[PDB]
Design a protein around this ligand. Structure first.
Ligand code: PDE
Ligand code: ZN
Ligand code: ZN
Ligand code: ZN
Ligand code: ZN
Ligand code: ZN
Ligand code: ZN
Ligand code: ZN
Lengths: 219, 222
């Protein structure tokens, strides 16, 4: 089968700047009728893929001409003259010249924006959960940029690495920031044996750790 | 308006088989090739096969002969893909598409895609979720705006549907992708509102887990 190699894997570009993605094939994509069947698809977060370009450089209907494609043989390039927020997603080159049709591994386009500090919120277990014998402490770190962030949980001063469950959203198409949720789960018994619960984060926007905590007591 | 509607998420036991459907409307079903594409763990697309409903003619990617069987019912304008003897590699999202390449014109017409059907191959049991409201104490963010949350944990399989105030409240909402641990998924969502809104007017988390016919509403009380 034809191997399709895309580079780069990810690209971070600011709104208004150009971007270009490269696609290489292990065999020439020139078909015997003289046509080159190389397509480009865009898959936006949570949507199905959509074709942007066919026959190397022909734009599909409804596709902005800020997007152009070029190349021949084994080397192809997709270019976006001016990036807009709606261009966020994964781009794929797919060849139809050789059977079976094969796809490149994809290039994720992310919009580079100004640094944004996380807004952190922490939540103690609800009565409901405690009744059942479990206790989860939740920490939301909303709207930050870059995506690179490290969160640690500390209970009464010592790091707790077990029972932590993290999840990140994809880049938001409204403000280009990222958000993350971090949940520490313990038994009700152990929860009631400690005092301080701290959600600690490391991020480019601050030289010292970003902290959020609460002390559980009674009254 | 050309549309392709695919069937819902499937939880399949290893070794068994499933039949996925792709219902079309808005164009002459018999005149265009329908293609099926597979997507594993995010970015990672593979072309499966194509069928021309008019004649029943099909072409398969070698890797999938014996795994996939494509059929089309002209009377209901529905394309089907049967997957047999499922195993680990078969857990993926499957798309059907009226791709648009017209072999005779050596050119293309617009491509339309279904929304995708997620297939999970597992023998783990179906479990209803527990929904927990998250009211601030330090997650108050002081005055101005306050963020609330909703924790959905211990369910299987995906998906679960979470809305705030029945869909009314959609701005300032972040719903995090579910994470699997110990045969159970956990999901959460946060909503940011102004101090004037909450606690004054109520905020309610709506959760639905079709696999277990679970539908639960949790009001965020102070
Ligand atoms: C393999 C061979 N070649 C052709 O006839 C040309 C097919 C070009 P295409 O852009 O429709 O291929 C694709 C079709 C479908 C996808 N897809 O991603 O669904 C990608 C490419 C053949 O059928 O004999
Ligand atoms: Zn060939
Ligand atoms: Zn050949
Ligand atoms: Zn201690
Ligand atoms: Zn101690
Ligand atoms: Zn302690
Ligand atoms: Zn102690
Ligand atoms: Zn064309």
């Amino acid at each position: 089968d034809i191997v399709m190699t895309q580079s780069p894997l990810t690209l971070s570009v600011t709104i208004g700047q150009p971007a270009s993605i490269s696609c290489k094939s292990s065999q020439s994509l020139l078909y015997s009728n003289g046509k080159t069947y190389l397509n480009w698809l865009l898959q936006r977060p949570g949507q199905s893929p959509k074709r942007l370009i066919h026959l190397v450089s022909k734009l599909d209907s409804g596709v902005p001409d800020r997007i152009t494609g070029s190349g021949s043989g084994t080397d192809f390039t997709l270019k976006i003259s001016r990036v807009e927020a709606a261009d966020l997603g994964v781009y794929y080159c797919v060849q139809g010249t050789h059977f079976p049709y094969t796809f490149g591994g994809g290039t994720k386009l992310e919009i580079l924006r100004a640094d944004a500090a996380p807004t952190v919120s922490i939540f103690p277990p609800s009565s409901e959960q405690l009744t059942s014998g479990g206790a989860s402490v939740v920490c939301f770190l909303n709207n930050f940029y870059p995506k690179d962030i490290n969160v640690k949980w500390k209970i009464d001063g010592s790091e707790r690495q077990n029972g932590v469950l993290n999840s990140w959203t994809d880049q938001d198409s409204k403000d280009s920031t990222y958000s993350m949720s971090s949940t520490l789960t313990l038994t009700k018994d152990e929860y009631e044996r400690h005092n301080s619960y701290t959600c600690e984060a490391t991020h480019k926007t601050s030289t010292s750790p970003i902290v959020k905590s609460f002390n559980r007591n009674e009254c | 308006e050309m549309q392709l509607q695919q069937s819902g998420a499937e939880l399949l036991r290893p070794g068994t088989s499933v039949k996925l459907s792709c219902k079309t409307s808005g164009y002459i079903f018999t005149s265009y090739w329908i293609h099926w594409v597979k997507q594993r763990s995010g970015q990672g697309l593979e072309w499966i096969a194509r069928i021309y409903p008019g004649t029943g003619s099909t072409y398969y990617n070698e890797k999938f002969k014996g795994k996939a069987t494509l059929t089309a019912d002209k009377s209901s304008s529905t394309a089907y893909m049967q997957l047999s003897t499922l195993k680990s590699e078969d857990s993926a999202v499957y798309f059907c598409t009226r791709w648009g390449f017209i072999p005779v014109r050596e050119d293309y017409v617009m491509d339309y895609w279904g929304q995708g059907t997620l297939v999970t191959v597992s023998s783990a049991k179906t479990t209803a979720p527990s929904v927990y409201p998250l009211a601030p104490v330090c997650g108050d963010t002081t005055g101005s705006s306050v963020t609330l949350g909703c924790l959905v944990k211990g369910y299987f399989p995906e998906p679960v549907t979470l809305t705030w105030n029945s869909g009314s409240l959609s701005s300032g909402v972040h719903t995090f992708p579910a994470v699997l641990q110990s045969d159970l998924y956990t999901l959460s969502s946060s909503v940011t509102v102004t101090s004037s809104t909450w606690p004054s007017q109520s905020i309610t988390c709506n959760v639905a887990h079709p696999a277990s016919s679970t539908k639960v509403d949790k009001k965020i009380e102070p």
